Amino acid sequence: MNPIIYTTLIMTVMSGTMLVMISSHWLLIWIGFEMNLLAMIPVLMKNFNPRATEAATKYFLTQATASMMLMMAIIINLLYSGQWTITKMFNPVAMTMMTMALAMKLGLSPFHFWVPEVTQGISLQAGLLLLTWQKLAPLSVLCQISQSINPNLMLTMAMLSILIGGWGGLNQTQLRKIMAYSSIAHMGWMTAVLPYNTTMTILNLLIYITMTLAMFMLLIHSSATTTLSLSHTWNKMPVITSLMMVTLLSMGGLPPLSGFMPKWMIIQEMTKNESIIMPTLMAMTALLNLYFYMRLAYSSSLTMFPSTNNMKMKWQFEHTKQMKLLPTMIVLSTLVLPMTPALSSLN
Amino acid sequence: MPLVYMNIIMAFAIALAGLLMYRSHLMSSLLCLEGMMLSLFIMSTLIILNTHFTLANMMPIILLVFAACEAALGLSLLVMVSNTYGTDYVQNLNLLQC
Amino acid sequence: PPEPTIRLQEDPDPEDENLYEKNPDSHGYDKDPIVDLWNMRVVFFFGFSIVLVLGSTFVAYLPDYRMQEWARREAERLVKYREANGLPLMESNCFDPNKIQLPEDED
Amino acid sequence: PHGSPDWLKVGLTLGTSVFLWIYLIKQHKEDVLEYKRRNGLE
Amino acid sequence: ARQWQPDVEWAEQFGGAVMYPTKETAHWKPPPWNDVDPPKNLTLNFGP
Amino acid sequence: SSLLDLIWLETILPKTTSFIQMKMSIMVSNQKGLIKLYFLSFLITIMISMTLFN
Amino acid sequence: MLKIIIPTTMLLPMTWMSKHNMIWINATVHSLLISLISLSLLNQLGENSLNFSLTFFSDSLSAPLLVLTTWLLPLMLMASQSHLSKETTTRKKLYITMLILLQLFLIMTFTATELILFYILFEATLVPTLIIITRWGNQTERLNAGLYFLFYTLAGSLPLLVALVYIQNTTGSLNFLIIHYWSHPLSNSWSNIFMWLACIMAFMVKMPLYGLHLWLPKAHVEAPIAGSMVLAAVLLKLGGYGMMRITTILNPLTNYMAYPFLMLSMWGMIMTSSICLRQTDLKSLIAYSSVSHMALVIVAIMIQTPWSFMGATALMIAHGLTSSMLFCLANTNYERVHSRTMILARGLQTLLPLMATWWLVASLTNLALPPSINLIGELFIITASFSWSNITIILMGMNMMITALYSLYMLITTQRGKYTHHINNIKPSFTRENALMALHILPLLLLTLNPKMILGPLY
Amino acid sequence: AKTLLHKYSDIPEGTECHRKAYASTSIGGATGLIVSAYSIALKPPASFLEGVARTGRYTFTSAAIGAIFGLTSCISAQVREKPDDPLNYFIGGCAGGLTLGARTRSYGIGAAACAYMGLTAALVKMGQLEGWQVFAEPKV
Amino acid sequence: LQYGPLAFVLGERTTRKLTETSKVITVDGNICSGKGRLAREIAEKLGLRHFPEAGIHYADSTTGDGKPLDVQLSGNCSLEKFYDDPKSNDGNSYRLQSWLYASRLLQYADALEHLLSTGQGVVLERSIYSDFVFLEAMYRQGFIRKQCVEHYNEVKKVTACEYLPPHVVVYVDVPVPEIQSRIQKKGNPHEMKITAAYLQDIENAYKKTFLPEMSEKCEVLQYSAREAEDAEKVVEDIEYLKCDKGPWPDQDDRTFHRLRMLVQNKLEVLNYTTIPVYLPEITIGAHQSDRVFQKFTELPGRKYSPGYNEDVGDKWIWLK
Numbered sequence A: 001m002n003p004i005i006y007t008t009l010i011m012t013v014m015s016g017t018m019l020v021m022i023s024s025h026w027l028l029i030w031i032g033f034e035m036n037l038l039a040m041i042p043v044l045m046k047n048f049n050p051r052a053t054e055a056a057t058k059y060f061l062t063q064a065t066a067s068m069m070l071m072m073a074i075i076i077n078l079l080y081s082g083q084w085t086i087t088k089m090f091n092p093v094a095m096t097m098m099t100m101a102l103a104m105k106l107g108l109s110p111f112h113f114w115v116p117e118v119t120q121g122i123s124l125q126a127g128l129l130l131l132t133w134q135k136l137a138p139l140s141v142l143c144q145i146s147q148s149i150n151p152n153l154m155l156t157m158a159m160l161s162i163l164i165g166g167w168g169g170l171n172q173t174q175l176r177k178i179m180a181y182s183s184i185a186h187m188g189w190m191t192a193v194l195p196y197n198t199t200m201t202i203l204n205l206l207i208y209i210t211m212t213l214a215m216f217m218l219l220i221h222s223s224a225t226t227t228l229s230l231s232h233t234w235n236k237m238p239v240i241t242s243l244m245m246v247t248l249l250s251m252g253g254l255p256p257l258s259g260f261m262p263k264w265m266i267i268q269e270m271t272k273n274e275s276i277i278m279p280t281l282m283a284m285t286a287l288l289n290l291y292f293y294m295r296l297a298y299s300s301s302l303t304m305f306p307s308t309n310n311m312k313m314k315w316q317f318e319h320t321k322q323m324k325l326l327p328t329m330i331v332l333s334t335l336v337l338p339m340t341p342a343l344s345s346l347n
Numbered sequence B: 001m002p003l004v005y006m007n008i009i010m011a012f013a014i015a016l017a018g019l020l021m022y023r024s025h026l027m028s029s030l031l032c033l034e035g036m037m038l039s040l041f042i043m044s045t046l047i048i049l050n051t052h053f054t055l056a057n058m059m060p061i062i063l064l065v066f067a068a069c070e071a072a073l074g075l076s077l078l079v080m081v082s083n084t085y086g087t088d089y090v091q092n093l094n095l096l097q098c
Numbered sequence C: 001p002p003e004p005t006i007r008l009q010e011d012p013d014p015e016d017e018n019l020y021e022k023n024p025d026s027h028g029y030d031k032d033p034i035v036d037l038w039n040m041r042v043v044f045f046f047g048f049s050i051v052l053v054l055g056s057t058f059v060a061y062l063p064d065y066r067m068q069e070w071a072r073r074e075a076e077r078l079v080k081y082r083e084a085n086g087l088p089l090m091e092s093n094c095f096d097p098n099k100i101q102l103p104e105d106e107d
Numbered sequence D: 001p002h003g004s005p006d007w008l009k010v011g012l013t014l015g016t017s018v019f020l021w022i023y024l025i026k027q028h029k030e031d032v033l034e035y036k037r038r039n040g041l042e
Numbered sequence E: 001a002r003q004w005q006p007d008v009e010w011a012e013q014f015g016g017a018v019m020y021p022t023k024e025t026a027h028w029k030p031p032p033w034n035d036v037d038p039p040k041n042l043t044l045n046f047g048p
Numbered sequence F: 001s002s003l004l005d006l007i008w009l010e011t012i013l014p015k016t017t018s019f020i021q022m023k024m025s026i027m028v029s030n031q032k033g034l035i036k037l038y039f040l041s042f043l044i045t046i047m048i049s050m051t052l053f054n
Numbered sequence G: 001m002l003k004i005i006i007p008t009t010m011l012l013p014m015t016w017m018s019k020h021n022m023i024w025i026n027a028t029v030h031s032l033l034i035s036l037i038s039l040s041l042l043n044q045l046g047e048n049s050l051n052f053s054l055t056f057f058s059d060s061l062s063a064p065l066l067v068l069t070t071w072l073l074p075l076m077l078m079a080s081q082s083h084l085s086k087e088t089t090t091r092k093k094l095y096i097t098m099l100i101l102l103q104l105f106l107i108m109t110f111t112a113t114e115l116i117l118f119y120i121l122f123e124a125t126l127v128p129t130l131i132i133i134t135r136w137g138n139q140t141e142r143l144n145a146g147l148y149f150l151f152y153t154l155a156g157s158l159p160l161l162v163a164l165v166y167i168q169n170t171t172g173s174l175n176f177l178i179i180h181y182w183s184h185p186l187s188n189s190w191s192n193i194f195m196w197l198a199c200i201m202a203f204m205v206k207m208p209l210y211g212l213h214l215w216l217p218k219a220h221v222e223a224p225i226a227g228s229m230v231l232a233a234v235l236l237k238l239g240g241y242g243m244m245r246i247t248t249i250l251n252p253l254t255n256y257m258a259y260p261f262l263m264l265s266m267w268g269m270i271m272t273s274s275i276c277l278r279q280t281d282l283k284s285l286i287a288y289s290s291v292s293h294m295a296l297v298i299v300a301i302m303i304q305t306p307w308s309f310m311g312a313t314a315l316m317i318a319h320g321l322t323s324s325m326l327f328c329l330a331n332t333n334y335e336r337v338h339s340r341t342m343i344l345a346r347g348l349q350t351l352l353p354l355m356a357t358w359w360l361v362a363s364l365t366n367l368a369l370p371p372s373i374n375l376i377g378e379l380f381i382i383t384a385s386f387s388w389s390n391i392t393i394i395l396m397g398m399n400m401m402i403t404a405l406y407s408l409y410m411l412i413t414t415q416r417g418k419y420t421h422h423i424n425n426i427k428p429s430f431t432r433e434n435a436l437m438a439l440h441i442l443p444l445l446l447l448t449l450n451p452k453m454i455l456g457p458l459y
Numbered sequence H: 001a002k003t004l005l006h007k008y009s010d011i012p013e014g015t016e017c018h019r020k021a022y023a024s025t026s027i028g029g030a031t032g033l034i035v036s037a038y039s040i041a042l043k044p045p046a047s048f049l050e051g052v053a054r055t056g057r058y059t060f061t062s063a064a065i066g067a068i069f070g071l072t073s074c075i076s077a078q079v080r081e082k083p084d085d086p087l088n089y090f091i092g093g094c095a096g097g098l099t100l101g102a103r104t105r106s107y108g109i110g111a112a113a114c115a116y117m118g119l120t121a122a123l124v125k126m127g128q129l130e131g132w133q134v135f136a137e138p139k140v
Numbered sequence I: 001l002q003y004g005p006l007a008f009v010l011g012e013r014t015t016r017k018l019t020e021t022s023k024v025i026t027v028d029g030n031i032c033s034g035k036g037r038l039a040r041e042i043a044e045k046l047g048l049r050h051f052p053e054a055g056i057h058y059a060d061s062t063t064g065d066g067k068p069l070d071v072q073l074s075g076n077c078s079l080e081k082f083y084d085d086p087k088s089n090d091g092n093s094y095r096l097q098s099w100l101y102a103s104r105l106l107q108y109a110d111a112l113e114h115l116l117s118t119g120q121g122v123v124l125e126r127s128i129y130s131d132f133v134f135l136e137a138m139y140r141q142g143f144i145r146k147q148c149v150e151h152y153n154e155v156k157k158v159t160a161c162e163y164l165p166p167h168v169v170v171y172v173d174v175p176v177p178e179i180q181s182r183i184q185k186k187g188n189p190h191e192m193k194i195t196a197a198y199l200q201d202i203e204n205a206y207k208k209t210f211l212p213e214m215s216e217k218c219e220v221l222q223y224s225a226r227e228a229e230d231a232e233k234v235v236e237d238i239e240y241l242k243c244d245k246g247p248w249p250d251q252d253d254r255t256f257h258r259l260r261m262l263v264q265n266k267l268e269v270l271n272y273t274t275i276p277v278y279l280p281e282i283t284i285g286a287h288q289s290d291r292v293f294q295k296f297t298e299l300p301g302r303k304y305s306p307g308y309n310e311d312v313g314d315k316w317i318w319l320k
């Protein structure tokens, strides 16, 4: 599309998210969600093809259903108490409806089915935007009402999301579906600490956003969407493969990388609340995410796959466009463990 | 909470279930979504009028406008899908899979 | 079946290279004789001459921070004192019973 | 391609670095003095 | 005398639509290299 | 050497773990991509949450 | 403690700014110098410890391990100089970087005043070893070996993090000094039993305990020579050091908790020693011998007596040195034959007499011939186990006899008999290999003159 | 809901074998019905009749598992005269596991079931005894 | 200011640069035809820019210095070996075909970039279109296998679905006996070995599979050897025809912006030429790939970016 139109649509998406984040009236939060949904579709459908159209219509259906459920929860809350402010929910039924709507917006299990297909359909830039920016508003809404959530339902869907992501990432060869399942697992990790501490949720969100930005920018730099296509990256730009391997190790939670910070802090916080079994199961399940990260690293950088003859022309050319902040994102997603006590800033 | 509110909530639940069934015909999915927003409009209007909360007489109008805009967006998406496949059948959207 | 029976264009497996053939007195460190000889010299010197000898001598002459002869002298003076005064050497109780307040059972 | 050292960008980068360093040092000195004034050390 | 590196037969394990192929997923095909699938004027008779 | 080490110890932890995880991965990821079944499951899930958590 | 840490960190820029043909010389010289600095730490007191700061301390249990870790790097560089000849300068620098990072992680692990820092570094050691195994490995099973090595360790050590955070939430501290001074008994409870298991299993899996030792043969056989050296010498002792540090809070629960592990180790030393008798690979045989020795060390730690602890420390040091030397000898044979099979190259004493002398000395030291420190640790642990129960002597004697049997079997099969006729590429042994063996073997016979340096804090 | 849990838990461990067996059967039937609902939703095999056959098979299998577990555990607790002992739950749980193996007609799943259900039942009994929480409330 | 979204936003519109003269033109002829002379003549009379036919080392002439690189570092194939042994066991024929197709794709992208950036038209020899005639002839003669042509078809579809076809295609028609006589007169010993069946298959492919397909979306001028000698009539036919059937009139400023972003960034142009499909003729082992890439990195001005090579003589490196 026209660059002016694209910039306006991106600004509208961001302004809808900010409207959700800064408003204190439930109707304004709903309006922000509607504005974000309205401006999101052309971004996903920027490169016109049947796959993008199918992904866009699936995303539209899911988000419209979630918004309708959220509106119903708001109306029930208003019925049982003449309040519009985002505070304690005031009703057991209203809270359940709202939690399911926000889980559907976030993609938490069992409402995860749309994320892998929407990510596969859209391009890598739309996938980056969808998996990074489209998590801020629902998570902020969940944080604002964290004192109302029933811990059983939140913990159940969090553990389900972790298990589903771990199991579903094992079966994928497409990189975008791998990233989608990783996002589902990380969402499950994020929502398992909302009943106890929202600062841990925000810290995990920041770390995951940095890691996902680094990974998607690396994937865009080496234009590969399949495992075998990424297996050709060493023959042209081995530094990109080495950085990608380090980032993958970080995303698996291996210390002393940055990705070890959120799991460590969440486990410690959950143990402070006399919860022992769930962190153990969560780490055991994150082992699966680490396994398929290791498989990707094996196929990418730790071994050398066969190449083709036509790579000799690619050897002669350099990337016309260089993405700013890629170096900063890699460093932030790799080497910030010693700066852990900085989380007291209420990030 | 009297019986009229229960009837409207039952209508909303029926519309949501009908949306979640998907026999076929994505147009029926859009119809179920619009039935849901209509039920929301009715029940919110009843709540607002019963309690004499003057300033929320705006809100049903805003809800209607936004939901109709979403309806137009969904109709455009359905038209594009139909032009791609020749029909609005749900089962034709199987290119992307888990 | 006109296939070439070749899976791909691959370099042949190279034959291992003897360091002695192109350079006798090879020392097995490097293919360049000068860098090889200096690597041998630095390894031999800094290991055997420096560490293995000087550090061994340093460890041999470490001062007694573990306090062995001090314990010997303390034990000698205590046994001299106790034998002379009729005290029965070592005492069974490590702490004097006067300073322990046992809890009365009254069972 | 064929490019000379872009003196405009180099000048802006060096100026930004120097300005940031001087502002940081001034901020630190002001913080130290104002801390001392509040707690009555010096 | 040479370090082993993956060959075509090894690399073909990761070329399918999904890992661990099954009977049900045996017919699945990878998506096209570019994410574009093939696409695969009325007449009016104004008589008397 | 063989019976214990190369067979049964290998069967107990690693092979069993790999088999179970692969089977669960196959079960989870074997979805045809039809929104019919997905939203039917969503309806089933929504009903369960309402009646089992309150 | 920073006087050791900072030079090890400066090893990295020195390596990366070195000339293309001067990386090995500079790395070896500065690693040897760093090792000399480490020697000062050995001076130890009979009192508490060498508490340098709030972050790091040294002890007579940590000092020999630190000295061995610092001493191992020049030997690993010497061993790796050969097979990396046809490698690009950047990749050789990356290999040296991996070795330096592993040394730094081990050095910070062994001091580690606080337990979460110990866990963080104890897990940080996992990455460079994995990269070394799965990148510079010859065979195609290196990937599976690395997967086994990673996942066994992580499955073992993930509950340890939960146990540690729970312990800090309850007690309030994880500093080892406060933990030791404020220790309290553990009541016989199911929760305490599972806490004991979570505290113990992470170190058990890395010993390796019998039945959980599957990863070790794969990782040792598929690793390059430097990786095998470090894995056999230092990485196995991390579990023993952790158990020695953590068994202070597990009392009196350990008295009955130890039985399953004691039985497993006592029978598994016999099992692995017997496995060594029927082995067609040198590296696998050496790995299984390592498993037997570490099982006996597990027995020593579980008995939890002063003689047990002294013997365990001495045996850890001696086994590290001996296993490193044996792996180096096997690699020298492999780089000539490229087979890694015992029965192929035979009668090498006729062709390489001095290397045969090195083989004999290494086998005698592995056989625990007196007055080597190997037998010092072996005998102390045997006496402690006999005091624990007089019936252990049967298993200990069986293990000793089988150990001598397979050690001399390995010596005789490769060094004696008639040379293989069709093998004609067996060149004279280089000065580098001979110096490597000498620098492996001389410290053992020098340490047997001052055994108190390796007998630990309970001496 | 939690009604089935209350009906099962209110019975003493060493008494009323039939009541415990019936409660376990009800819980197993509910679990099997939920699993069947998910299986039907995610995978419509061929038709209505084959689907209801699948539902009945799953429900009967789960109910039999629960009934065997409850009966065996309660009889073990009664006969051994040592209530509040996880060994009884171990034995009953993998009696249920062995019945699963028999229903599926393969020995390997039966042995794996005895292992992984006896340990699970013993863990649940231990958690009841020591008061472990799976879904902890936010204390701090 | 390199072209991008900002340039399009502020001033850069390439529709104003079109002056009815752009008219990308492609000339096609059988081996040893007079098309090269004819194409060159058209470029000079119309004021357009001539593009010599892309060979093995076309990409070498556009990067770094114009000097070609070694054969093992660029192309890994030779036409002389194809002429001598068309059925070579090392799969040289299909490697040659694929490398030539990739070179033609790069040249077409360069020509499109020049036309969209300056407005001056270009004249091309055999382009990505009609490059399949050599593939068809080689397959019919048994020089290549069927999997090779399947791979060629896949790559050709995925690559050529993103560009505009030429406005005018000019064909010079020469009989096979006459062109064989021209080959004999040429004097090249390797070219002497071309059989008549190969030329006949080439010729059959051009008329049968290329002329009607370009007749449906372009404008065709079938010319013979005699009437192609005078370029005045060719040029007159060029101006007389008006293009109104192709996709070019349907384009606008936004499509031109997209195409201009596509033609630059040649790494995106050549993206799908290295798809991970393993045919023995073109797949290369890991060890050979590593060795050849390390040799390529050791080329004088190829280790770093073009402006960051001190060995060439680039100065002020520490401030660029």
Ligand SMILES: CCCCCCCCCCCCCCCCC[C@@H](O)O[C@H](CO[C@H](O)CCCCCCCCCCCCCCC)COP(=O)(O)OCC[N+](C)(C)C
Pocket (backbone or CB within 6 Å): C051, C052, C055, C056, C057, C059, C060, C061, C062, G064, G067, G068, G071, G317, G443, G446, G447, G449, G450, G454
């Ligand atoms: C080859 C043919 C023969 C030629 C050689 C002939 C000569 C034979 C001599 C060789 C051995 C014969 C035995 C003679 C022993 C006398 C020396 C002995 O007395 O010194 C020992 C001293 O030796 C050292 O203590 C031990 C050596 C240090 C070992 C450290 C290793 C060096 C660092 C290398 C890296 C470390 C790797 C392993 C990590 C732990 C013990 O002394 P000690 O009774 O106690 O007190 C010393 C004197 N005081 C009282 C003033 C304090």
Ligand SMILES: CCCCCCCCCCCCCCCCC[C@@H](O)O[C@H](CO[C@H](O)CCCCCCCCCCCCCCC)COP(=O)(O)OCC[N+](C)(C)C
Pocket (backbone or CB within 6 Å): F012, G188, G189, G190, G193, G210, G211, G212, G260, G261, H085, H086, H087, H090, H118, H119, H122
């Ligand atoms: C596979 C290769 C080796 C891996 C490592 C294996 C080592 C792990 C083994 C764990 C050690 C033992 C665990 C618990 C020991 C406590 C003693 C207890 O088991 O004995 C009796 C316990 O009785 C019964 O055993 C109850 C438990 C029955 C359920 C346990 C399952 C039995 C076999 C499971 C083995 C599976 C191991 C591998 C897991 C994957 C004592 O009766 P009681 O006085 O009442 O209980 C005393 C404890 N109190 C005081 C806290 C109450």
Ligand SMILES: CCCCCCCC/C=C\CCCCCCCC(=O)O[C@H](COC(=O)CCCCCCC/C=C/CCCCCCCC)COP(=O)(O)OCCN
Pocket (backbone or CB within 6 Å): A274, A276, A277, A280, G152, G155, G156, G159, G162, G163, G166, G190, G191, G192, G194, G195, G196, G197, G198, G201, G205, G212, H123, H130, H131, H132, H133
């Ligand atoms: C090589 C693979 C080995 C893998 C490790 C195997 C053993 C793992 C150890 C058990 C896992 C959980 C560790 C417990 C974490 C420490 C916390 C703790 O001790 O507190 C206990 C918590 O104890 C538990 O909750 C334990 C529950 C166990 C659930 C997880 C089961 C995992 C598998 C258990 C069986 C296998 C264990 C041995 C394996 C043998 C080797 C394979 C008390 O909790 P509170 O409620 O606060 O206090 C009680 C008073 N109100």
Ligand SMILES: Nc1ncnc2c1ncn2[C@@H]1O[C@H](COP(=O)(O)OP(=O)(O)O)[C@@H](O)[C@H]1O
Pocket (backbone or CB within 6 Å): I029, I030, I031, I032, I033, I034, I035, I036, I053, I079, I096, I097, I100, I131, I133, I134, I135, I191
């Ligand atoms: N698809 C192809 N395959 C192999 N060789 C080709 C192909 N296309 C062109 N060539 C070679 O490129 C050379 C130049 O083409 P040609 O038109 O015959 O000569 P000229 O450029 O002098 O007119 C010729 O030797 C021809 O064989």
